[PDB]
Design a protein around this ligand. Sequence first.
Ligand SMILES: O=C(O)c1cccc2c1OCCO2
Ligand SMILES: O=C(O)c1cccc2c1OCCO2
Ligand SMILES: [Cl-]
Length: 147
Amino acid sequence: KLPPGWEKAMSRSSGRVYYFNHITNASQWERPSGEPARVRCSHLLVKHSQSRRPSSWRQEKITRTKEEALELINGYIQKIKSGEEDFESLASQFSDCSSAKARGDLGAFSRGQMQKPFEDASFALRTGEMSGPVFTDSGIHIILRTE
Ligand SMILES: O=C(O)c1cccc2c1OCCO2
Ligand SMILES: O=C(O)c1cccc2c1OCCO2
Ligand SMILES: [Cl-]
């Protein structure tokens, strides 16, 4: 029916059908369009107190709860989707990954290199698509597939 991971759902506020991807946590009103050895992704990471390494270039001691990290992620997603901010701008400013200095770019990678939820989301994104919140042991990610 739909590309990998996508399913139909009903909006609770509007009653209109939308589409949700349970691999990427992407959600959208529009019916999703239409696997390579490698993809290229950028990401914005928000770490929390239960991150594998609760430290980043932004903060020596990361203390925010996972719930607070998710709220931050949700707010960045809203600004990206509204066009108020660019993904790259938010990643450079607020990603708890050292890839922040490359606008979140991780370069290209294969299956078998990244943490599984990140890998699965990356490979289920189409080129140009953005994930919803993706959870790993590092924290919570927004992933943008660029190639
Ligand atoms: O170590 C770094 O400064 C760095 C710079 C750009 C991209 C990265 C980086 O480290 C984590 C992987 O992705
Ligand atoms: O793997 C790393 O530590 C690293 C360091 C600098 C730049 C990078 C890196 O990983 C891939 C992205 O580009
Ligand atoms: Cl915070």
